[PDB]
Design a protein around this ligand. Structure first.
Ligand SMILES: CC(C)Oc1ccc(C(=O)Nc2cccc3c(-c4ccc(CN)s4)ccnc23)cc1
Lengths: 38, 289, 247, 238, 38, 247, 247, 38
């Protein structure tokens, strides 16, 4: 329920389930293998 | 076999029997089955089309009504000289303190439900000035979170705890808590010990720990004292129930255990649950004309 | 904005109300459901389970002794053995039973009852009993040829240990009340009586005295109505350690 | 049909010639934990016939003054055979149980035992505020005796105990009772040393009596764990 | 009427009329007959 | 107008409520969005990043020295080197970690942990270690042939510097609690222990003492539940210059 | 949320309001309906049933004697026998009648009335009566040749015992009022008068005096409007045992 | 407007215009005529 004219007035947006944890866990230019890493 | 039952069963008319080898009134209790004798087999019956509903004995309806779980009175005053609930209290949440709800819940072994919580506040002047329209803060403190030490401690800033702020002039404050057990159901009874050492509590499943309810008056004290009483009501909803139990007969002794003593004499004595009659041939309320 | 007005009952707290309410823990995921044996969905499933009647509710019957009735060989024909008060509201053999305890959370009831009796004498013991239900209106019958005029079963002891007496729903009204006035026409069910049809006959090496266990349950034509606080439990004080929850 | 029974599990078998059918608790049968209910991710050991077999406990004497007897599961079996060894070496356990209770007498004896399996039989103490201690509850293989069977030692009711899975041994009718118990817990597995899912209670609601020459009338309990699984291997607590 | 985002916020669910009383009344492995039971 | 009535909870301020509210600045246009590196959308992405354990939380270990464990050549076989307390709720080597700090905003947890150890001796140093996880129930093992019965990895030092021990989710319940009663059956995880599998062997020109750095992270089967105020921060007073904001 | 504002009349308790309200007993199943004789759905069905007029409302008429009018043989022609006041609001022969009592719960009325008279003399008694309705405007007629100018029926006693005089709805307005000012032009109906058309003639062995019973009902063109508290009942005190309900 | 789950909670039902006044005015087994009644 949102009758205000400005969209920032709306309630919270709890639906964004996209993740990409590899940008913090795997920032290596050549991807790891499942295999000696070095 | 599982079936949808909305009304009590119909009765069919029945005739005279006299059949050799057929004895529907004989049973064998030793099997542990309940008697399967039907009325049509015991007597001659008429046809009755039965319209009586069964919805009021649904487990949802039996349990989902709001009952008192907590009641605390405290002084709202300048507390500098007090030794006491100094404008706030902490309650360790439980369902065992008020016996009417306790006995109903203890009809079952396992329960899964969400808890509708209603908070009712009332105020009286200490021994008249009118009644102040105070603001209260209730804060839920889960396991391992820090409880407030003082009315004005920074724990009340509630960065991640859920708090509700409510006025005395408001309708009762209301929130729902989800089913929050770490198991699929609460253990209404627990034949076990809470810790890996031998000294842990008997009879409480650690899995069912809710946490603490902390309630303060948010207003600074007035020049005169008041007594504030907070009542907490819980209504189970979205209920599943497993393994029905024999009801409690003897008075409850403690919230911590099932310990028992009984009343001094029947009814509900340890030696005699039902009150006595003079003999097994005595009819106590016999009609006489 | 929308023009509105408040009705009577605005702001009330009714303990049986049924509304949605604000979730205190947003995005909380409850533990997955798991299959557990023995789910109950209607309390009428419990009252259909037979449970022992406290028929021997007499002084000098202590504890377990109250759950059985002892029968002996008699030397007079057709003697009365025991009667069962049928008041579920007033204290009596039916109160502390599964049907009894659940029903006392309600005010109105309808439908048939079954009483089952298990004979627990020795294999060599023999006998016949007559179990009678008398519909209400007069006094409880004290002689067999009076009780025989009501609804009854003649039970011969044998390989099958147990007999059922059905108490059929015989009532002017759709429901009876769990009324403290037991003599009210809206409440009184009548009587169950047991007489010797023949005699208990045992050889010298069997015990001369034998026991019955009586059980009661509801049938599936049974219905309960108007929920109330059960008078079976109460407290005058706080329980032990209930205060310590605030400390 | 209903009167004779043979039970065979592993290297063990029992025959009875006077059964009274048998009880499957709540109509369930024991099963292994399926993947859609599982929590612990290590591969379980399933010893089968090494654990899933009848163990016989010490017999108890039925006497005129008996109040009845109880044993807690898994506690009573936690030190017996390969079931006990797997219990001691593993953090987590799950099983059903097959319970068979044995008591015979002559055709001149009378007596009735209620044989009832109680889930989560949390005991009370009599006439104290102090909760039962560890040694009041954890009786092991020997089991315990009822203090006040009339209230099931928990402020409740023997009369309504028929709401639990049960049979009777009525000496006139039958000489054994059989109850099959599924896994009965709020969690899919448990630590076997701190929680008991089931209590077997045997209560003499009608006392033993006769006018023949007296003999010792024992009650004997045989329990088979069923579909045992163990998780979390480590050293033995033992 | 339920405008909250969490489904546990809803009002009570009083519509489940399924019963199976035989799991408490008839837990015998061989079903009773309507006929000597033993 | 529309007839209406107010429910319980009308007028309450619940800090976790979720409604629209009146825009104070109508027609305001926010600054266009710009791509920024490193967007986080779930806090579980952070707890999957490994971070150093404070295993050497001993007096006389100061600052950085607490983040490493020193290993020396021994003259007795199979000696214990260190143990790691697995309590995230009670203070211990796991608390000040990314998984630790984020998890302490929650009450319930589930899922596997990984511990990674990096050997930081010289190239000429050699050795084998055994790292053991013991599921809960008894005391922490003090001998290698006791610890060896649990979950373990035998680590040979080599060109690959680092080994992982997985702590698999082995629990009766779906979740554990961050409970201050560490011995509770709903909370205790068990123990990690490190023993010599062989020995640390170094030539004369290498340093005789070598260090391990231990790291912990969650795996992606990990879940957190029931948000709470973290006990890691607090204030007894106003901060400096917080008053000056009113002046 | 929805923007709203409260109107005048918000929070009022109007005793004739018509809203749904919260069910105090959820899932309660009322007793099945059963066919009962004599269902009433409109109160106009009751006022169509004829009931006795108290025409002999005179001192020295006691009880039942007030419900009949005694007629005797006269020796003068065309004499007046009785008149009936037509005021339903003011006390008079019509008040304690089914049409009267129900109508006094209302303020406005319209439609025709029927008066039926039953002659209860002996079979051998003979006679003719003239029954006249005079529309309002002047005094009640005291002579037959004045009353004869209005609406009338000439009744001959015979095998059929009873005659009807219709009072037709003759009014300027759609409705009249039950007004305490009986002379108001919005209220006055006029008069009913009975005269001898011939004479009551009886033989010596019949009783010389005979009775009429008068009845009144509404016709089905009758309508009632604007409900009010009836002035037929009141209390100055609590009733006996009304206090005991609090004890 | 009725959002309660029990139908007895509803507002009043003022729509039943069925009448049968003859059950009180004409309970004679042989119906009257419009004609000497006796
Ligand atoms: C401050 C506000 C935002 O949040 C709250 C949070 C909680 C409360 C409160 O008292 N709840 C409660 C009071 C009483 C019982 C409970 C239960 C139980 C289910 C099974 C149990 C057996 N062990 S117990 C669960 C959740 N809650 C409960 C009130 C307000």
């Amino acid at each position: 329920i949102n009758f205000y004219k400005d969209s920032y007035a709306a309630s919270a947006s709890k639906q964004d389930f996209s993740q990409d944890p590899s940008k913090f866990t795997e920032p290596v230019v050549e991807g790891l293998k499942a295999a000696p890493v070095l | 076999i599982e079936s949808i039952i909305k009304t009590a069963t119909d009765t069919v008319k029945s005739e005279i029997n006299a059949e050799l080898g057929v004895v529907p009134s004989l049973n064998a209790v030793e099997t542990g089955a309940t008697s399967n004798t039907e009325p049509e087999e015991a007597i001659q019956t008429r046809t009755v089309i039965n319209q009586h509903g069964v919805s009021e004995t649904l487990v949802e309806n039996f349990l989902s009504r709001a009952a008192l779980v907590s009641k605390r009175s405290f002084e709202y005053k300048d507390h500098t000289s007090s030794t006491a609930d100094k404008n706030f209290f902490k309650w360790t949440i439980n369902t065992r303190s008020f016996v009417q709800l306790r006995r109903k819940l203890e009809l079952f072994t396992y329960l899964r439900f969400d808890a509708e919580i209603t908070i009712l506040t009332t105020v009286a002047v200490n021994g008249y000035v009118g009644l102040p329209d105070l603001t209260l803060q209730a804060m839920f403190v889960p396991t391992g979170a820090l409880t407030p030490e003082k009315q004005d401690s920074f724990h009340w800033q509630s960065g991640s705890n859920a708090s509700v702020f409510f006025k005395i002039s408001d309708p009762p404050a209301r929130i729902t808590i989800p089913f929050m057990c770490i198991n699929s159901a609460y253990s209404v009874f627990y034949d076990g010990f809470a810790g890996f050492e031998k000294n842990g509590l008997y009879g409480i499943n650690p899995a069912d720990t809710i946490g603490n309810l902390c309630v303060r008056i948010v207003n600074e004290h007035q020049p005169v004292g008041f007594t504030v009483t907070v009542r907490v009501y819980m209504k189970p909803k979205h209920i599943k129930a497993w393994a029905p139990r024999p009801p409690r007969t003897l008075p409850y002794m403690s919230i911590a255990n099932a310990n028992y003593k009984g009343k001094e004499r029947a009814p509900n004595a340890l030696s005699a649950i039902i009150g006595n009659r003079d003999s097994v041939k005595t009819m106590p309320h016999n009609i006489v004309n | 904005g929308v023009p509105t007005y408040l009705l009577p009952g605005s702001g009330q707290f009714l303990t049986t109300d049924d509304h949605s309410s604000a979730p205190a823990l947003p995005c909380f995921n409850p533990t997955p459901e798991m299959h557990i044996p023995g789910q109950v969905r209607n309390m009428l499933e419990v009252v259909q389970v037979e449970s022992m009647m406290e028929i021997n509710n007499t002084e000098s019957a202590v504890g377990m002794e109250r759950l059985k009735v002892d029968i002996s060989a008699l030397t007079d024909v057709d003697q009365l053995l025991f009667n069962i008060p049928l008041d579920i509201q007033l204290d009596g053999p039916l109160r502390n039973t599964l049907v009894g305890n659940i029903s006392r959370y309600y005010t109105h009831w309808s439908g048939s009852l079954e009483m089952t009796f298990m004979f627990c004498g020795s294999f060599m013991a023999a006998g016949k009993l007559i179990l009678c239900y008398t519909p209400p209106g007069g006094s409880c019958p004290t002689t067999r040829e009076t009780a025989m005029l009501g609804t009854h079963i003649v039970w011969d002891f044998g390989l099958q240990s147990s007999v059922t007496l059905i108490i059929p729903w015989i009532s002017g009204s759709h429901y009876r009340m769990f009324n403290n006035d037991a003599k009210s026409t809206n409440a009184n069910v009548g009587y169950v009586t047991c007489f010797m049809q023949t005699n208990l006959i045992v050889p010298s090496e069997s015990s001369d005295t034998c026991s019955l266990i009586g059980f009661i349950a509801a049938k599936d034509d049974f219905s309960l109505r108007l929920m109330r606080d059960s008078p079976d439990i109460g407290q005058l004080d706080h329980l032990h350690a209930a205060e310590a929850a605030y400390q | 049909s209903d009167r004779v029974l043979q039970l065979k599990l592993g290297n063990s078998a029992i025959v009875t010639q006077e059964a009274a059918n048998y009880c499957c608790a709540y109509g369930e049968w024991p099963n292994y934990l399926p993947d859609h209910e599982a929590v612990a991710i290590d591969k379980p050991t399933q010893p089968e016939t090494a654990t899933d077999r009848f163990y016989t406990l010490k017999s108890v004497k039925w006497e005129t003054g008996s109040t009845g007897w109880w044993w807690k599961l898994p506690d009573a079996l936690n030190n017996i055979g390969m079931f006990g060894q797997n219990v001691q070496h593993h953090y987590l356990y799950r099983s059903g149980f097959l319970i068979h209770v044995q008591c015979n007498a002559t055709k001149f004896h009378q007596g009735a035992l209620l044989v009832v399996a109680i889930p989560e039989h949390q005991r009370g103490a009599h006439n104290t505020n102090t909760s039962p201690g560890f040694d009041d509850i954890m009786k092991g293989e020997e089991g315990g005796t009822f203090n006040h069977p009339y209230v099931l030692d928990d402020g409740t009711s023997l009369a309504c105990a028929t709401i639990f899975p049960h049979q009777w041994i009525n000496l006139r009718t039958n000489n054994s009772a059989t109850i099959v118990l599924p896994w009965m817990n709020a969690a899919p597995m448990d630590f076997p040393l701190r929680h008991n899912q089931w209590t077997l209670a045997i209560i003499p609601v009608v006392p033993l009596g006769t006018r023949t020459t007296s003999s010792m009338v024992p009650i004997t309990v045989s329990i088979a764990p069923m579909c045992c699984e163990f998780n979390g291997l480590r050293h033995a607590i033992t």
